[PDB]
Design a protein around this ligand. Sequence first.
Ligand SMILES: COc1c(F)c(S(N)(=O)=O)c(F)c(NC2CCCCCCC2)c1S(=O)(=O)CCCO
Ligand SMILES: COc1c(F)c(S(N)(=O)=O)c(F)c(NC2CCCCCCC2)c1S(=O)(=O)CCCO
Ligand SMILES: [Zn+2]
Ligand SMILES: [Zn+2]
Lengths: 260, 260
Amino acid sequence: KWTYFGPDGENSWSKKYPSCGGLLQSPIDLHSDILQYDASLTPLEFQGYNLSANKQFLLTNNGHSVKLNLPSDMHIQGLQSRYSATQLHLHWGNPNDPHGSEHTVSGQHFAAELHIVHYNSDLYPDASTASNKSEGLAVLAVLIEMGSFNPSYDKIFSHLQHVKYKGQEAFVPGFNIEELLPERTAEYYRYRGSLTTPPCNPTVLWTVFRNPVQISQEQLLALETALYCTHMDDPSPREMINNFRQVQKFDERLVYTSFS
Amino acid sequence: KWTYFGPDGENSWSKKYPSCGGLLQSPIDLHSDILQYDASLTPLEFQGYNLSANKQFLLTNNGHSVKLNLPSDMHIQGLQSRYSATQLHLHWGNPNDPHGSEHTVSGQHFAAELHIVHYNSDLYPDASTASNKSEGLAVLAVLIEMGSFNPSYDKIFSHLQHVKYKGQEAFVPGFNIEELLPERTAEYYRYRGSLTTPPCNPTVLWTVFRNPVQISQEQLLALETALYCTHMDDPSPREMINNFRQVQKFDERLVYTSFS
Ligand SMILES: COc1c(F)c(S(N)(=O)=O)c(F)c(NC2CCCCCCC2)c1S(=O)(=O)CCCO
Ligand SMILES: COc1c(F)c(S(N)(=O)=O)c(F)c(NC2CCCCCCC2)c1S(=O)(=O)CCCO
Ligand SMILES: [Zn+2]
Ligand SMILES: [Zn+2]
């Protein structure tokens, strides 16, 4: 009931999902005028990110992105509460305009963006319960640019042809999710925002790493061309492209940086 | 019942104005991937722009912008139809983030933007009738950067302290509107889009000049701090700031340029 293109696109989300027209919306443009160094921000620690290769994790095309389910055994230290993983997914552009990150830096998109979603497991029993609650979610965002082939991202991309259409699912063996993170994870942007998709709940603590990772031109094109938003039996297929939200207004508020 | 900030802000405009969630929406980011040089794009001619110093033209705070009424003897020649002037107005940011142009260039906002609104006088009798019809409108856009004082823009700005509140009106003596335009008007971006405010009609032929103009720090600050969205006797004033729409998705479509 929502898309990124056409009559049900992002300008209309607020009709059935009021929080999409509400407070604390994400994503945003990270730029000098709204940044402040905060010396009390501390480095995150990534625990249980090395998932067992003898276990398996479901990859799903949900019609909006490709998601990988993650175990609650995976968690972040360094926030006020323990946040445990629930899923990761990506956002990207299209072959003719391969600049589909959600966040921008100084007005610039990156090629794509990876989000690793966690929920506050000290307060809430599961992500669904946390999702619309105070302090419920924390998302790690990795900005992606074109460059060297990235074997670690290929551990996701090499399975995409098995989830081409909405609803399709495939298992992926465990691998080390930390390999998907950039250099100097200590350096990041942090702000209070929202889910970037309906329902747009204003319940996400965002951490956007300063430094991008690289994937090759061939990997980017593979991601942009692999998937469809529609079911196999849909008479009007739609390619999964440009599945990122435009940046939001961000006035009389601040993003905090862990680097001066 | 629409604003740029809060529950009646731009993500909610579609609830009130159907075209705001429709096709062909403006403004957009002007960037390499969606540009295409078109040698058929020849210089516009600005006719009747030298308004008589012996006449007065109405400046109005309409609660959303400051507009100057323009006579229908001003017109643009060079497009398929003649388009005659109806008004000009501005968009800007705020002192803490003085980057409130509507259009962006390679992801960068300029300080402000001037729009000179015209209607298709060959097809339609007046601007209101044209506004929701095929090829109804044509808007000229000038990007404004902060730098040197601009005597020509000060012919408008010098009256801002007499139109501080909604509904208030002042007279501006005629002057040569062409003085508001930048260097090398032959260089421009052209695309089909929409009004950037409700009702968001997709009926505008946009011409964005390549080169910005400059206004001083003091001029920009006056524009950002002189005006209120509310009436003179509200005990709860609302400043007129950040009156620009975020850039829209622009996919499977091109902006044509008169420069390479
Ligand atoms: C790709 O869509 C996103 C998404 F973009 C984001 S973002 N960018 O991190 O805010 C998400 F967080 C989620 N997942 C969250 C999971 C934890 C709470 C349970 C509710 C869903 C939110 C998802 S989703 O694939 O699950 C689809 C949700 C439709 O409501
Ligand atoms: C500042 O608001 C704008 C505006 F932003 C733009 S834009 N950026 O060029 O699309 C406008 F064109 C207009 N005027 C057009 C006048 C000709 C048609 C009649 C309907 C209004 C469109 C106006 S307005 O001040 O008149 C307020 C319109 C409220 O609906
Ligand atoms: Zn996401
Ligand atoms: Zn305008």
